Enzyme design. Structure first.
Site, PDB file in Angstrom:
ATOM      1  CG  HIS C  89     -39.922  12.085 -51.448  1.00 23.67           C
ATOM      2  ND1 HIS C  89     -40.629  13.268 -51.365  1.00 23.67           N
ATOM      3  CD2 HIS C  89     -38.595  12.402 -51.474  1.00 23.67           C
ATOM      4  CE1 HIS C  89     -39.734  14.250 -51.319  1.00 23.67           C
ATOM      5  NE2 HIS C  89     -38.494  13.751 -51.377  1.00 23.67           N
ATOM      6  CG  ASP C  92     -52.512   7.768 -52.650  1.00 26.61           C
ATOM      7  OD1 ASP C  92     -53.203   7.176 -53.482  1.00 26.61           O
ATOM      8  OD2 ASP C  92     -53.117   8.279 -51.620  1.00 26.61           O
ATOM      9  CG  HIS C  94     -56.190   9.431 -56.246  1.00 22.96           C
ATOM     10  ND1 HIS C  94     -56.839  10.631 -56.336  1.00 22.96           N
ATOM     11  CD2 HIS C  94     -55.433   9.501 -55.119  1.00 22.96           C
ATOM     12  CE1 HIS C  94     -56.505  11.377 -55.298  1.00 22.96           C
ATOM     13  NE2 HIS C  94     -55.659  10.733 -54.531  1.00 22.96           N
ATOM     14  CG  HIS C 129     -51.164  12.662 -54.007  1.00 20.14           C
ATOM     15  ND1 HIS C 129     -50.924  12.489 -52.672  1.00 20.14           N
ATOM     16  CD2 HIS C 129     -52.454  12.318 -54.203  1.00 20.14           C
ATOM     17  CE1 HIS C 129     -52.038  12.057 -52.086  1.00 20.14           C
ATOM     18  NE2 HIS C 129     -52.991  11.951 -52.992  1.00 20.14           N
ATOM     19  CB  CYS C 130     -45.356  12.538 -52.666  1.00 16.59           C
ATOM     20  SG  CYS C 130     -44.276  12.129 -51.323  1.00 16.59           S
ATOM     21  CG  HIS C 139     -43.929  15.550 -49.306  1.00 17.38           C
ATOM     22  ND1 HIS C 139     -42.838  14.833 -49.744  1.00 17.38           N
ATOM     23  CD2 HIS C 139     -43.673  15.902 -48.031  1.00 17.38           C
ATOM     24  CE1 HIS C 139     -41.950  14.774 -48.757  1.00 17.38           C
ATOM     25  NE2 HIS C 139     -42.417  15.433 -47.707  1.00 17.38           N
ATOM     26  CG  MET C 144     -43.603  14.538 -55.064  1.00 20.60           C
ATOM     27  SD  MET C 144     -42.323  14.324 -53.762  1.00 20.60           S
ATOM     28  CE  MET C 144     -41.742  12.808 -54.480  1.00 20.60           C
ATOM     29  CG  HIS C 249     -63.725  28.725 -70.185  1.00 19.01           C
ATOM     30  ND1 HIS C 249     -65.105  28.672 -70.180  1.00 19.01           N
ATOM     31  CD2 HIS C 249     -63.375  29.509 -71.218  1.00 19.01           C
ATOM     32  CE1 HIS C 249     -65.559  29.354 -71.211  1.00 19.01           C
ATOM     33  NE2 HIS C 249     -64.545  29.892 -71.864  1.00 19.01           N
ATOM     34  CD  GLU C 273     -70.801  28.598 -69.651  1.00 17.48           C
ATOM     35  OE1 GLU C 273     -70.438  29.742 -70.007  1.00 17.48           O
ATOM     36  OE2 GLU C 273     -71.925  28.327 -69.200  1.00 17.48           O
ATOM     37  CB  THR C 274     -66.735  26.603 -67.136  1.00 14.09           C
ATOM     38  OG1 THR C 274     -66.491  27.749 -67.975  1.00 14.09           O
ATOM     39  CG2 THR C 274     -65.800  26.576 -65.981  1.00 14.09           C
ATOM     40  CG  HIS C 300     -63.854  31.127 -66.586  1.00 16.01           C
ATOM     41  ND1 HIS C 300     -64.487  32.181 -65.979  1.00 16.01           N
ATOM     42  CD2 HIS C 300     -63.867  31.403 -67.911  1.00 16.01           C
ATOM     43  CE1 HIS C 300     -64.829  33.059 -66.901  1.00 16.01           C
ATOM     44  NE2 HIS C 300     -64.485  32.622 -68.095  1.00 16.01           N
TER      45      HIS C 300
HETATM   46  O1  LIG Z   1     -64.154  33.507 -71.695  1.00 21.32           O
HETATM   47  N1  LIG Z   1     -63.111  33.223 -70.805  1.00 21.32           N
HETATM   48  O2  LIG Z   1     -62.757  34.062 -69.994  1.00 21.32           O
HETATM   49  O1  LIG Z   2     -54.807   9.578 -52.050  1.00 24.60           O
HETATM   50  N1  LIG Z   2     -55.351  10.417 -51.071  1.00 24.60           N
HETATM   51  O2  LIG Z   2     -54.695  11.346 -50.630  1.00 24.60           O
HETATM   52 CU   LIG Z   3     -42.626  13.578 -51.346  1.00 26.65          CU
HETATM   53 CU   LIG Z   4     -64.843  33.545 -69.840  1.00 24.09          CU
HETATM   54 CU   LIG Z   5     -54.957  11.417 -52.767  1.00 25.73          CU
END
Ligand SMILES: O=N[O-]
Ligand SMILES: O=N[O-]
Ligand SMILES: [Cu+2]
Ligand SMILES: [Cu+2]
Ligand SMILES: [Cu+2]
Ligand SMILES: O=N[O-]
Ligand SMILES: O=N[O-]
Ligand SMILES: O=N[O-]
Ligand SMILES: O=N[O-]
Ligand SMILES: O=N[O-]
Ligand SMILES: O=N[O-]
Ligand SMILES: O=N[O-]
Ligand SMILES: O=N[O-]
Ligand SMILES: O=N[O-]
Ligand SMILES: O=N[O-]
Ligand SMILES: O=N[O-]
Ligand SMILES: O=N[O-]
Ligand SMILES: O=N[O-]
Ligand SMILES: O=N[O-]
Ligand SMILES: O=N[O-]
Ligand SMILES: O=N[O-]
Ligand SMILES: [Cu+2]
Ligand SMILES: [Cu+2]
Ligand SMILES: [Cu+2]
Lengths: 334, 334, 334
Positions: C89, C92, C94, C129-130, C139, C144, C249, C273-274, C300
């Protein structure tokens, strides 16, 4: 406030893609806006092949009608479930606050009705949809969704705060359907909603729509039902997708001002070619036409558009501008 | 205006990911910029397994070449379909206004050519693609797409209105392919384009690409063809996807300034890890490298990147900055 | 700077959806913030059916814990891979710059540990993440991944530059799993990770998750583990998806202020909303509750939410506001 002191106005909705009459800039103070919708379960033919599904609709259409109010109006919806229907239904407004958008308060068996009121406290275009506990995506993906527009009281504004006024508005509801398929890839058919349910769920779980359509059917916004405009007109297209992402595009045009996620307190994105409306959202795009002819309005996953149904047309009238585009040498052999 | 009074400049395009020479800030007034592209249908090996498809290309490459002009220049494209090709083709520019982006005016049979002119009235990066009526997604998803950049005449600007100047530019075109599979999951092969069409449509309708690649093939932007930079250089990466969403990410870096939907009148998004370019769109990301070594540039659906092909590399030269990152205790057993 | 001159603070992480104690506005100058995570490979039951997978975790949970620092702090992570694990493992970030986000410097076999330091130069929420070379999506999609929040030193700000202060924070990690299925559609089971790998890759290549869950399992954020709030409280929900798009949402609410792509130097989107969080990204949404009761917080795509698992609940305490919403006529026959 004593809401009983406010004006009331009644609206009879109209069928998409048209929109009931309204004023962009509010000509009155805050009002209670009264809407009535009648649920209709009905057979619908959704493609050129004649595939027929059992649709679940608000007011007889897919999508349901666009409601239009202004910020801090109250929406009062009478929702009727006639005894000619089979299923339980309700309504969730993404514009509303509380009670699962209204769904917890609006459960109606066949033979029942209800009246919900909510305050439209946020400006924007918003999805509404049915959402019965335990069966939500089946109702939504059977067509039971629409949108509501909550205009700012002083109308729309550009990125600089100056007014934007549309001459025409259309509502494009985009619907993903999941017709069950057998091993051979053939559509399956069902005798009752209860006998359909498990295979409906299985089909939904593929996450692969069989059809993706505007206004309820392949080709619905074409031919005698193409959208129309004139050169120089300002057009707002409200577009919703209650369940799945879409990426609208006007082929031959642009979105001059786009609220991709639909909320008017934000500045619009300018000059978009294509924009992402996430599933569960309504967006709005404003364009001033500059050339006549046929345009296609599509979901720009072009498979979704041209194979699965997510394509409509505009027919635009007026003068051709050769400065903007011209054929210098027409196709020829030389 | 009499367009005949304007300067003309000819450009011979270069193969992606490189970009023809241009100036960010316009050194002349508005011009007619002349481009020529020759359509080539050709076999292409797209993966390490040796899978060979019949690709449809502008100028011999997937993607087609990046064209660069300035706002309110005119683009004059001579499009040639040699008689060695089999199919009808055309071109739709998302940068253009009218006639389906040019597609209605540029239909060329094998043995024909045409010249289209349009005014580049909106700044941004935009997709262009083939779009023959009735067969649009088949051409696009066979590789027949590219991009055009319409720079503001005063170059790029940050969120505060101050200049942003790139030292290097690359064009990454991302292509979803849909190679038909049989019951066993094996790729199927075809003898003519007409015999291929129905299974091509069936494969597209799965909405599940078999390959998603940069610059036309798995691993194309790796090895001797990795992208390059030096520490401290400012790099613009233009990324397009004509048909399907992508989510670019520089592994080990960021998008310092990102126009995710590609339109330069809008302020960029700052400090992005990952950004969504909707299908049918070009986007652009600007980054100043701060560390040397290998980077991977990916679609951050990591299955799409590392299993289906949407991954390339940068090799960056220069000084390592231990303030920014260091190994305090190297991997060890203790 | 001599980093050895800076304060050090140690944090023991807490299990999602809770977040370790921190201060929004930095109460000290820049610090080295020390975190320790222990990798645990373990069986996890992910659905109501009892489906059990071999999960790969940071600190025993899916997602991994939320780390919180301020801009230009240094993060010093001790990563331990006990000899009770089977696999290689790494990690990373970001948020970090260089060496594939740390992945090139943190490869640990079972029985090994490592310590990485990086400077958190950009404010925002970010995925970690891994990412072991050649096996990255396996992974990530085995659980992960987690997130790190890098707060501005003066805390969060609205679109006008005024402070936004949350009362509560929750971290929702959304996980797409790809349990292999046979011809019949039945889940397959595996005896070792090596025997699982090819069918894991095949299942991933479908691009169709079998499960999409919050906090590691269907229903994890429900019941006695529902999220909670009071009317009038300001809540920040950090949401990550390391591999695939999502569209959060709040059913019955909104995102009052949303950084959909998670980076705090940008103004938030208002009244959503979303919102779309692209795969490979963390986003953050701020909401002030205005009504009590049960809310559902969902992806949603309602199939993803209600069939595949991407749904949790809030239970909100307080006064009901009948101005905002009321039942005018409860469901009845008349
Ligand atoms: O309004 N949400 O499904
Ligand atoms: O961090 N990029 O997979
Ligand atoms: Cu891993
Ligand atoms: Cu909805
Ligand atoms: Cu990444
Ligand atoms: O109901 N959807 O267009
Ligand atoms: O009809 N039930 O609320
Ligand atoms: O240019 N629209 O396909
Ligand atoms: O099968 N779709 O129209
Ligand atoms: O409306 N233009 O003739
Ligand atoms: O278009 N006349 O060659
Ligand atoms: O043509 N696409 O990279
Ligand atoms: O070659 N047809 O325009
Ligand atoms: O099968 N994709 O490279
Ligand atoms: O370019 N840095 O040595
Ligand atoms: O990295 N030296 O333990
Ligand atoms: O690890 N994902 O919630
Ligand atoms: O344990 N290898 O860095
Ligand atoms: O099969 N999904 O919970
Ligand atoms: O917290 N409201 O009673
Ligand atoms: O809700 N009372 O009819
Ligand atoms: Cu219903
Ligand atoms: Cu073509
Ligand atoms: Cu297009």
């Amino acid at each position: 406030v004593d809401i009983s002191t406010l004006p009331r106005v009644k609206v009879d909705l109209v069928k998409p893609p048209f929109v009931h009459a309204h004023d962009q800039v509010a000509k009155t103070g805050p009002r209670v806006v009264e809407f009535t919708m009648t649920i209709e379960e009905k057979k619908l033919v959704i493609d050129r092949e004649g595939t027929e599904i059992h649709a679940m609709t608000f007011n007889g259409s897919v999508p349901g009608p666009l409601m239009v109010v202004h910020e801090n109006d109250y929406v009062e919806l009478r929702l009727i479930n006639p005894d000619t229907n089979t299923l339980l239904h309700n309504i969730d407004f993404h514009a509303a606050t509380g009670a699962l958008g209204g769904g917890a308060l609006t459960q109606v068996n066949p033979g029942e009705e209800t009246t919900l009121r909510f305050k439209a406290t946020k400006p924007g275009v918003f999805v509404y949809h049915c959402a019965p506990e335990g069966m939500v995506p089946w109702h939504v993906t059977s067509g039971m969704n629409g949108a509501i527009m909550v205009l700012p009281r002083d109308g729309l504004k550009d990125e600089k705060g100056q007014p934007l006024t549309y001459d025409k508005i259309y509502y494009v509801g985009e619907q993903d359907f999941y017709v069950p398929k057998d091993e051979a890839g053939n559509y399956k058919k069902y005798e009752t909603p209860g006998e359909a349910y498990e295979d409906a769920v299985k089909a939904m779980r593929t996450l692969t729509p069989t059809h993706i359509v505007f206004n309820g059917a392949v080709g619905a916004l074409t031919g005698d039902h193409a959208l129309t405009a004139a050169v120089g007109e300002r057009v707002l297209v409200v577009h919703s997708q209650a369940n799945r992402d879409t990426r609208p595009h006007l082929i031959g045009g642009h979105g001059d001002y786009v609220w991709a996620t639909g909320k008017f307190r934000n500045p619009p994105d300018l000059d978009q070619e294509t924009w992402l409306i996430p599933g569960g959202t309504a967006g709005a795009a404003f364009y001033t036409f500059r050339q006549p002819g046929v345009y296609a309005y599509v979901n720009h996953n072009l498979i979704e558009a041209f194979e699965l149904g997510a394509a409509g047309h505009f027919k635009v009238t007026g003068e051709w501008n050769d400065d903007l585009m011209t054929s210098v040498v027409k196709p020829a052999s030389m």
